[PDB]
Amino acid sequence: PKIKTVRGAAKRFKKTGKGGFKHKHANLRHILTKKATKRKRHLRPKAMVSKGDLGLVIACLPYA
């Protein structure tokens, strides 16, 4: 049979041009009056998945 995509991981990652994955940062969903505005501003843009945990992402997303 076909491999099934981990459908939770398909809602968290998008493949970029050279094959890396972008994702939204954590810690920006709730409890926000105590966080500095400098801290939040560096959490709005999407970041790339680091090299260590990039192996687990590809296993969850076989169809890119």
């Binding site: 981990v6 991981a9 809602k11 968290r12 990652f13 945990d53 687990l56």
Partner: protein, 96 residues
């Protein structure tokens, strides 16, 4: 994705975005695909006959990728700025 009992990376991270249904019925066209049609006119129905965009597509842009040499009338499709300069330099006539 099992990391031991640690909360895995695909669940530590938040969901984001949505899926656009309108994006599935759009397509992008090389300039090299403009010569592959016949008659020198480009419609939605001409490109589907040339097996370029596919049947369910309803919107298409022409992109500066590849190159065109023959004069080609583009009709009813969006064109980027670099593709507009490249089509009109080779003798084309972009219209609607």
């Amino acid at each position: 994705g099992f990391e031991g009992g640690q909360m895995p990376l695909y669940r530590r991270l938040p969901k984001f975005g949505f899926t656009s249904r309108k994006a599935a019925i759009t397509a992008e066209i090389r300039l090299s695909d403009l010569a592959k049609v016949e008659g020198g006119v480009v419609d939605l129905n001409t490109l589907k006959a040339a097996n370029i965009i596919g049947i369910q597509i309803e919107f298409a842009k022409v992109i500066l990728a590849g190159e065109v040499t023959t004069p080609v009338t583009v009709r009813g499709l969006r064109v980027t700025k670099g593709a507009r300069a490249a089509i009109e330099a080779a003798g084309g006539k972009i219209e609607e």
